[PDB]
């Protein structure tokens, strides 16, 4: 990869509250690109929801 | 030199000088050129045949290109583009330093991470949830049993 | 604030230290309690200076030291360690490798992480402004006197 590694490490250069906000942002199905979680982990939250 | 400031190649300036050979100064109209021309013509190797239209444009083009690029170096004129600007650093330098030392989520204690999860979950999943019950509730309460 | 200066672990450690001084457990530090731990460390002070080192941190003037005053003492001690060295950490943010110079590539690395982006040419504009020596690298001495890169 190249300079866009900053986009991928943007999570680790953000406050922990903001990190977990990005991880849980996969509800509306229009935000499945910024969220880096695997689909199996996403399913567990949706099952509980 | 003005044509070089307009990003012209060596051919463009030469043809520009070819059509503008009549704009060279006249000795009678300037007092400075009176003594300069007399001093210039006193050199041993100065022949009047050397003032050909082609010979004039060649030397002027060569010197002008050197003169133009020389003042680009001594006077870079790159100022007023990025002056000392203090975009936000003088007050936000602590933030950018703090960004590179921000604690990753996996290093937090479990109880702290759970509290952050609850705040994130309610704002993004519970608040965003849509449940319309007002119409159903009013309809139920408006019925005589 | 205490939360900014101290973490949860540090507060726990300070409470254990406070409980070490307070053998009684009443929640206050008396002169004899303070004197006892000093003797365990070797010092043998008198009550004249023993009271003085209590009044220097005793806020309400009751003559005893409680945990809120003990934490306030430690909070100041953590805060006043750094006075003007904040520029050292700022220099190290731009200085990824760890040497005493800021390279253009290193300046690219931090600029890449930040929001603003450079076209790989204006990066030379501000580095030559900060670097007076003209060696292409901004050292620590050049950074503190004038900060642009
Ligand atoms: Ca006591
Ligand atoms: Ca007290
Ligand atoms: Ca370096
Ligand atoms: Ca230097």
Curated annotation (Swiss-Prot), chain B:
Disulfide cross-links? none
Species source reads: Oryctolagus cuniculus (Rabbit)
Biological role stated in the UniProt entry: Cytosolic calcium-activated calcium channel that mediates the release of Ca(2+) from the sarcoplasmic reticulum into the cytosol and thereby plays a key role in triggering muscle contraction following depolarization of T-tubules. Repeated very high-level exercise increases the open probability of the channel and leads to Ca(2+) leaking into the cytoplasm. Can also mediate the release of Ca(2+) from intracellular stores in neurons, and may thereby promote prolonged Ca(2+) signaling in the brain. Required for normal embryonic development of muscle fibers and skeletal muscle.
Name of the protein this chain belongs to: Ryanodine receptor 1
Anything else known: Binding of [3H]ryanodine indicates that the heterozygous channel is activated by Ca(2+) concentrations 4-fold lower than normal. Single-cell analysis of cotransfected cells shows a significantly increased resting cytoplasmic Ca(2+) level and a significantly reduced luminal Ca(2+) level.
Source organism superkingdom: Eukaryota
Per UniProt, subcellular location reads as: Sarcoplasmic reticulum membrane
Give the free-text PTM comment from the record: The N-terminus is blocked.
Assembly with partners or alone:
Homotetramer. Can also form heterotetramers with RYR2. Identified in a complex composed of RYR1, PDE4D, PKA, FKBP1A and protein phosphatase 1 (PP1). Repeated very high-level exercise decreases interaction with PDE4D and protein phosphatase 1 (PP1). Interacts with CALM; CALM with bound calcium inhibits the RYR1 channel activity. Interacts with S100A1. Interacts with FKBP1A; this stabilizes the closed conformation of the channel. Interacts with CACNA1S; interaction with CACNA1S is important for activation of the RYR1 channel. Interacts with CACNB1.
For domains, the record's comment is: The calcium release channel activity resides in the C-terminal region while the remaining part of the protein constitutes the 'foot' structure spanning the junctional gap between the sarcoplasmic reticulum (SR) and the T-tubule. Pore opening is mediated via the cytoplasmic calcium-binding domains that mediate a small rotation of the channel-forming transmembrane regions that then leads to channel opening.
**Coverage span on the entire protein:** 3537 to 3681 of 5037
Which residues, if any, are the signal sequence?
A: none
**Tissue specificity remark:** Detected in skeletal muscle (at protein level). Fast- or slow-twitch skeletal muscle.
Q: Which gene encodes it?
A: RYR1
UniProtKB/Swiss-Prot annotation, chain C:
Q: Where is this cross-link: Glycyl lysine isopeptide (Lys-Gly) (interchain with G-Cter in ubiquitin)?
A: 23
**SUPFAM superfamilies from the UniProt entry:** EF-hand
Any idea which residues bear Phosphothreonine here? 46, 112
Which GO biological-process labels does this protein carry? Answer: autophagosome membrane docking; calcineurin-mediated signaling; cellular response to interferon-beta; cellular response to type II interferon; detection of calcium ion; G protein-coupled receptor signaling pathway; G2/M transition of mitotic cell cycle; long-term synaptic potentiation
What disease involvement is noted? Ventricular tachycardia, catecholaminergic polymorphic, 4: An arrhythmogenic disorder characterized by stress-induced, bidirectional ventricular tachycardia that may degenerate into cardiac arrest and cause sudden death. Patients present with recurrent syncope, seizures, or sudden death after physical activity or emotional stress. CPVT4 inheritance is autosomal dominant. Long QT syndrome 14: A form of long QT syndrome, a heart disorder characterized by a prolonged QT interval on the ECG and polymorphic ventricular arrhythmias. They cause syncope and sudden death in response to exercise or emotional stress, and can present with a sentinel event of sudden cardiac death in infancy.
Q: What does this protein do?
A: Calmodulin acts as part of a calcium signal transduction pathway by mediating the control of a large number of enzymes, ion channels, aquaporins and other proteins through calcium-binding. Calcium-binding is required for the activation of calmodulin. Among the enzymes to be stimulated by the calmodulin-calcium complex are a number of protein kinases, such as myosin light-chain kinases and calmodulin-dependent protein kinase type II (CaMK2), and phosphatases.
- Write the protein's name: Calmodulin-1
Which species?
Homo sapiens (Human)
Q: Which gene encodes it?
A: CALM1
């Amino acid at each position: 990869s190249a300079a866009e590694t900053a986009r991928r490490t943007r999570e680790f250069r953000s406050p922990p509250q903001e990190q977990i906000n990005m991880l849980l942002h996969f509800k509306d199905e229009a935000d499945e690109e910024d969220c880096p979680l695997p689909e199996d982990i996403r399913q567990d939250l949706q099952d509980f929801h | 030199k003005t044509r070089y400031a307009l990003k012209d190649t060596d051919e463009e300036v030469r043809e520009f000088l070819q059509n503008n050979l009549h704009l060279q100064g006249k000795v009678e109209g300037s007092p400075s050129l009176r003594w300069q021309m007399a001093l210039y013509r006193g050199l041993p190797g100065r022949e009047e045949d050397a003032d050909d239209p082609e010979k004039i444009v060649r030397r002027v083009q060569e010197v002008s290109a050197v003169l133009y690029h020389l003042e680009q170096t001594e006077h870079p004129y790159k100022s007023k583009k990025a002056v000392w600007h203090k975009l936000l650093s003088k007050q936000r330098r602590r933030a950018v330093v703090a960004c590179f030392r921000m604690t990753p989520l996996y290093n937090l204690p479990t109880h702290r991470a759970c509290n952050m999860f609850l705040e994130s979950y309610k704002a993004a999943w519970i608040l965003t949830e849509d449940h319309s019950f007002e119409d159903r509730m009013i309809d139920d309460l408006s019925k005589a049993g | 604030h205490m939360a900014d200066q101290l973490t949860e672990e540090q507060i726990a450690e300070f409470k254990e230290a406070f409980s070490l001084f307070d053998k009684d457990g009443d929640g206050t530090i008396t002169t004899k309690e303070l004197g006892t731990v000093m003797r365990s460390l070797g010092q043998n002070p008198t009550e004249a200076e023993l009271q003085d080192m209590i009044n220097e941190v005793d806020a309400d003037g009751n003559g005893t030291i409680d945990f809120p005053e003990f934490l306030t003492m430690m909070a100041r001690k953590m805060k006043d360690t750094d006075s003007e060295e904040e520029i050292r950490e700022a220099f190290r943010v731009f200085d990824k490798d760890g040497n005493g110079y800021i390279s253009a590539a290193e300046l690219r690395h931090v600029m890449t992480n930040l929001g603003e982006k450079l076209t790989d040419e204006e990066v030379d504009e501000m580095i030559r402004e900060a670097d007076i020596d003209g060696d292409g690298q901004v050292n620590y001495e050049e950074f503190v006197q004038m900060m642009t890169a």
